Amino acid sequence: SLFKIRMPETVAEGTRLALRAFSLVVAVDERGGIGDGRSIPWNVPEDMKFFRDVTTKLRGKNVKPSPAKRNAVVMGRKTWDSIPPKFRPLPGRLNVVLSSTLTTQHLDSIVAVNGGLEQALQLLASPNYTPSIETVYCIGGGSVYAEALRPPCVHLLQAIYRTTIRASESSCSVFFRVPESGTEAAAGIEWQRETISEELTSANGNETKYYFEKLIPRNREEEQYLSLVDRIIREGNVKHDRTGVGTLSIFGAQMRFSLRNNRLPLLTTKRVFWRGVCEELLWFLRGETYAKKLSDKGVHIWDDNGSRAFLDSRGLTEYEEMDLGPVYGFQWRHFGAAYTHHDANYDGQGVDQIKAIVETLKTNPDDRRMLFTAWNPSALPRMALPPCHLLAQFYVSNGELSCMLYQRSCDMGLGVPFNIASYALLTILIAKATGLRPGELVHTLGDAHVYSNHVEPCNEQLKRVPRAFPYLVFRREREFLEDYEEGDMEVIDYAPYPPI
Amino acid sequence: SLFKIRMPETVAEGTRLALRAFSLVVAVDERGGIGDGRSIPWNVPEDMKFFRDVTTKLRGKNVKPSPAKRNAVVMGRKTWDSIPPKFRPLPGRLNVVLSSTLTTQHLLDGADSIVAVNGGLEQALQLLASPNYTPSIETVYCIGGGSVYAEALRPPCVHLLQAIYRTTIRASESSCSVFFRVPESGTEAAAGIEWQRETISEELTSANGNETKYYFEKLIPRNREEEQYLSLVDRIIREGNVKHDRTGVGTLSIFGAQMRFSLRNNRLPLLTTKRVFWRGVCEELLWFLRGETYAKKLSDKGVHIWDDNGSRAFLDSRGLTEYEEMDLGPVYGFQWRHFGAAYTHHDANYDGQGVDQIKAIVETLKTNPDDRRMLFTAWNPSALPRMALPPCHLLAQFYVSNGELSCMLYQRSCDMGLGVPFNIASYALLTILIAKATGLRPGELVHTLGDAHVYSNHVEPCNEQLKRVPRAFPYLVFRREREFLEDYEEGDMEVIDYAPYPPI
Numbered sequence A: 001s002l003f004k005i006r007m008p009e010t011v012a013e014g015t016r017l018a019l020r021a022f023s024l025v026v027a028v029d030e031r032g033g034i035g036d037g038r039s040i041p042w043n044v045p046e047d048m049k050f051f052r053d054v055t056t057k058l059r060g061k062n063v064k065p066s067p068a069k070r071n072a073v074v075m076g077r078k079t080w081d082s083i084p085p086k087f088r089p090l091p092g093r094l095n096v097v098l099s100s101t102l103t104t105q106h107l108d109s110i111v112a113v114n115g116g117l118e119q120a121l122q123l124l125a126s127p128n129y130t131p132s133i134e135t136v137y138c139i140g141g142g143s144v145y146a147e148a149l150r151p152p153c154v155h156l157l158q159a160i161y162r163t164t165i166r167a168s169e170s171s172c173s174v175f176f177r178v179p180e181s182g183t184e185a186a187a188g189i190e191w192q193r194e195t196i197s198e199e200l201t202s203a204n205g206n207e208t209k210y211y212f213e214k215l216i217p218r219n220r221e222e223e224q225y226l227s228l229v230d231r232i233i234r235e236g237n238v239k240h241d242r243t244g245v246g247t248l249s250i251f252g253a254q255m256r257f258s259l260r261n262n263r264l265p266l267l268t269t270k271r272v273f274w275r276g277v278c279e280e281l282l283w284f285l286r287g288e289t290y291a292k293k294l295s296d297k298g299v300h301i302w303d304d305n306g307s308r309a310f311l312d313s314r315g316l317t318e319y320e321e322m323d324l325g326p327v328y329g330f331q332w333r334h335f336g337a338a339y340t341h342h343d344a345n346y347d348g349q350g351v352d353q354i355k356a357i358v359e360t361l362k363t364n365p366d367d368r369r370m371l372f373t374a375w376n377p378s379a380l381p382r383m384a385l386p387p388c389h390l391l392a393q394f395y396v397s398n399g400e401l402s403c404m405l406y407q408r409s410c411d412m413g414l415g416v417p418f419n420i421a422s423y424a425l426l427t428i429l430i431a432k433a434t435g436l437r438p439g440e441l442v443h444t445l446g447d448a449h450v451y452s453n454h455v456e457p458c459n460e461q462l463k464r465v466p467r468a469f470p471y472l473v474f475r476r477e478r479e480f481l482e483d484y485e486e487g488d489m490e491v492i493d494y495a496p497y498p499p500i
Numbered sequence B: 001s002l003f004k005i006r007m008p009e010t011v012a013e014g015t016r017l018a019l020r021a022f023s024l025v026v027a028v029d030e031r032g033g034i035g036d037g038r039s040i041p042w043n044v045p046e047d048m049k050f051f052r053d054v055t056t057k058l059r060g061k062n063v064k065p066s067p068a069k070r071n072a073v074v075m076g077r078k079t080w081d082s083i084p085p086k087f088r089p090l091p092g093r094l095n096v097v098l099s100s101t102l103t104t105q106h107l108l109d110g111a112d113s114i115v116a117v118n119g120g121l122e123q124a125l126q127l128l129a130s131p132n133y134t135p136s137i138e139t140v141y142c143i144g145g146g147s148v149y150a151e152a153l154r155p156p157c158v159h160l161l162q163a164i165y166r167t168t169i170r171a172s173e174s175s176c177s178v179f180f181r182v183p184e185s186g187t188e189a190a191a192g193i194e195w196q197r198e199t200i201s202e203e204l205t206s207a208n209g210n211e212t213k214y215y216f217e218k219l220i221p222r223n224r225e226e227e228q229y230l231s232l233v234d235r236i237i238r239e240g241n242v243k244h245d246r247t248g249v250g251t252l253s254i255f256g257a258q259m260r261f262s263l264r265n266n267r268l269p270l271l272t273t274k275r276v277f278w279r280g281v282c283e284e285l286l287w288f289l290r291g292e293t294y295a296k297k298l299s300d301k302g303v304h305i306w307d308d309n310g311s312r313a314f315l316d317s318r319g320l321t322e323y324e325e326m327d328l329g330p331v332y333g334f335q336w337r338h339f340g341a342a343y344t345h346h347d348a349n350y351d352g353q354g355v356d357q358i359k360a361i362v363e364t365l366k367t368n369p370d371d372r373r374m375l376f377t378a379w380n381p382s383a384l385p386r387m388a389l390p391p392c393h394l395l396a397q398f399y400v401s402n403g404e405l406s407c408m409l410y411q412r413s414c415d416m417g418l419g420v421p422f423n424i425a426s427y428a429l430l431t432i433l434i435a436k437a438t439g440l441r442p443g444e445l446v447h448t449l450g451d452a453h454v455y456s457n458h459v460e461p462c463n464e465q466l467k468r469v470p471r472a473f474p475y476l477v478f479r480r481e482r483e484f485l486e487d488y489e490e491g492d493m494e495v496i497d498y499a500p501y502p503p504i
């Protein structure tokens, strides 16, 4: 259509292919030895059990692994050779073998990959594997672990499950060490001990001592969110909202989130309603104002503010139910245009801020005026609500598009994580529209608050260790920005905590 | 005046200076001793000279102390007694003497250069805060005895202590029974203040017949707020991206930053490491507040900051060929007071046209301080092409807690060298004025920066500025008030105790 924004013919320079996140499972001795090059020297049945259990089990309670939903184990060919023929393939799991020589048919529970772990992580990110494969485990061996600890794979590592066997084995010629936080080899990742078992003794007849630990990469960006929540609780002033409900509040804060390689800052310590986020954002981008378009895909976030009662209380007696007035996206695409009803034609009316930004980004990336706003004092009384996230500015450095969001009023529990996700998506889409790579989201908060009745619940959430952020993958592209659908994209490896 | 904003009855109450700021001068031995209870038990003429000079001299070049402009020295009665009658009062300075028994008239029996205060340093600073002594007194110096120094180091006085000039005499006097010690960082005695050395002299020898070694130090309370600014400039120079603006001038740039400045108790965040043009700041903000668009109104007052953006050539270069010279279009203030109104020329009548954002905010601040919609903006996409320049400081949000007004500024494009310090001062003033208009006290300024940048040529200058240790901020007082916000003049307010570094 004539007033839509045409997408580029080609992807931005540098854009990666999709990659699954994975966990690493390993057994080491005290000097970091894992094997002689053909086998594992020690015999510790308890580690065998642990390795089987962790790689087999799914996040769901007592769920049985099936072709429909299972885990995948990724292994080097030599590790496949070390498994005695009668125990292979490893039951309940998709066995992924890395080999330049061997093929799948030299043997659907097995698949060969001509390439390293990166290629395996690419394969499992295919639409053929993403619905059925819940977690990917790097189970070895040495050359796979080495690759796993190396960019690009190392940034996709969710967790390391390391068993330490208290044995001295001079036959070990292959090694594995988790680089300590702050060290050069750590490559900017801060490894943390999440759990450690008590020191246990094997019933192998040698009384071999062993223990387990789970290591995770520190999610600094979510810690930044939790520190703010914690600060508000500890130091915020008591305030009351429009319905007289108590909040704890601070004024003026700022957070940052990397969107690089389509990383998606969906918070892990509380599940964020991504589908609603995505549907709403696309609805903004299209310049929509009819909330029924959202209620019909089961996104009910605007129901309360679109009701006959609420619109009437806002003086908006002429609007149909769910007609919100010239809100958000309308101002984005038609700033200043007169509003009558949602179903009217607004093509070429008001200022199309999104259109202008997309054109300036392509020709003059150093420009300092690439901002869009929904804060239109003239049109505020005509809106169901004044805009919360009201302003955004774009910035370009190193072929990466960054965005700053300004938000006047910020509910830390629900609004904030939702809006971080919205603008992450927006920045990713605008990057795609302009031939740029996604860069950084900066979030500026005005009145940042927690509900006084959510204090105890938030305190419980603050004890949770943040997990890694998921990634966003586009399964198909569109000719126009406005034609993107929620179904066009997939959030991969989002593993948030269950409800409080 | 129907369209103006009426000031409440409490207009002066929340910005009246409670205590005047002061510096401290002291001579100590190496055990922190200052005297034996009656006198100073050493004889160092070079300290006497320094003491005289630092307490007498005014900030300018060759400005002679006069009743209209001089320093004050504040002393305890015992210190006044220790001065030989021939030498008192200390010439060229207002002599403030603390005493429960001695009156102003009874002191003259031992122009108007002596005052007795019935009370301590707090009482003296209270008196010196009044219009009779502020701003005619340039710097207050505490010089008095141990009891006066002790009161200087504890709240409420200590938070107003701008500088400590300490002379150390290298002797150890058993005789000393009164002491003075500067508290170190993080200690309880320091009351959250972090004393820092600005200067230390080389060790010198006194011509007193005893070869007494001595030295001078000037200590200043760490200004963390100005250090936010300096760290940011340093970060930009170190790791900012190279960019070029519309003219093609080179820039070093980072994206997305935030700073905080306290406006409590008359504090004014005018940067000290480089002098800010306060008079310009003040004239322009008032000009903004009035919804003004004719830059000649600033020109006529010697404020030339808009001259180059209002010339015939520049307006033509933005396609604004129908504007009279200095007519900037619907810029800044016009949007604050008349958002969305159609613009023709500067001299037309805009009363009641568009949205008066400032007035709406003032009304909401008085009735519902909890409101989260208290914002104004100059970012009007439909009017941007009509403006000489689109606004860089483009949006502000107000917030209220504990009767204190805070403001958040959003700035899309920030020139760190000139624009940023100017805009901090601007929005500090705005928050102060809005607080006065709404019966609130000034709280905090929060400054959000988009494209924060330093010019590639300005790099070396900035680097020299970066090694300066920021001094304490000055204060803003009102000489008088007005019936209407729009009626405030630059001569109505006075920046006091502003001691910025020299240029270079």
Ligand SMILES: NC(=O)c1ccc[n+]([C@@H]2O[C@H](COP(=O)([O-])OP(=O)(O)OC[C@H]3O[C@@H](n4cnc5c(N)ncnc54)[C@H](OP(=O)(O)O)[C@@H]3O)[C@@H](O)[C@H]2O)c1
Binding pocket: A025, A026, A027, A028, A033, A034, A035, A036, A037, A038, A039, A040, A075, A076, A077, A078, A079, A080, A082, A098, A099, A100, A101, A102, A114, A115, A116, A117, A139, A140, A141, A142, A143, A144, A145, A174
């Ligand atoms: N303790 C533990 O936790 C643990 C776990 C697993 C294994 N292990 C031990 O690890 C030792 C063997 O490991 P190690 O690295 O020699 O062998 P490995 O990692 O098991 O396997 C290496 C083989 O995998 C394939 N491969 C790896 N990277 C590839 C790439 N980039 N492209 C194509 N193919 C690739 C190649 O097969 P082709 O030669 O066919 O091309 C390569 O020869 C054994 O002692 C085993 O028991 C220990």
Ligand SMILES: NC(=O)c1ccc[n+]([C@@H]2O[C@H](COP(=O)([O-])OP(=O)(O)OC[C@H]3O[C@@H](n4cnc5c(N)ncnc54)[C@H](OP(=O)(O)O)[C@@H]3O)[C@@H](O)[C@H]2O)c1
Binding pocket: B025, B026, B027, B028, B033, B034, B035, B036, B037, B038, B039, B040, B075, B076, B077, B078, B079, B080, B082, B098, B099, B100, B101, B102, B118, B119, B120, B121, B143, B144, B145, B146, B147, B148, B149, B178
């Ligand atoms: N080395 C230096 O830098 C330096 C400088 C100055 C003085 N000194 C030495 O300091 C020693 C004496 O100082 P010190 O404290 O005893 O004496 P001081 O501070 O000079 O004076 C104390 C007197 O000031 C008045 N005062 C103080 N606080 C008051 C309050 N809250 N309310 C009412 N009146 C108040 C009282 O006078 P009334 O009793 O009349 O009411 C009090 O007796 C001497 O040895 C002097 O030489 C050293």
Ligand SMILES: CCOC(=O)CCCOc1cc(NCc2ccc3nc(N)nc(N)c3c2)ccc1OC
Binding pocket: A025, A026, A027, A040, A042, A043, A044, A045, A047, A048, A051, A079, A082, A083, A084, A087, A138, A139, A140, A162, A163
């Ligand atoms: C006690 C050691 O003695 C043995 O090696 C068992 C005899 C061979 O039988 C098998 C070998 C393998 N090898 C791969 C392997 C083994 C243990 C691991 N543990 C951790 N923690 N992590 C691993 N990644 C891991 C990987 C896998 C399955 C087998 O049969 C079920």
Ligand SMILES: CCOC(=O)CCCOc1cc(NCc2ccc3nc(N)nc(N)c3c2)ccc1OC
Binding pocket: B025, B026, B027, B040, B042, B043, B044, B045, B047, B048, B051, B079, B082, B083, B084, B087, B142, B143, B144, B166, B167
């Ligand atoms: C080297 C000492 O020799 C004497 O004692 C001179 C004889 C007394 O004559 C005077 C005494 C005072 N006393 C107050 C005084 C003195 C020095 C100070 N220095 C610093 N750095 N700081 C002070 N606050 C200070 C305060 C003042 C003025 C006098 O006559 C001009």
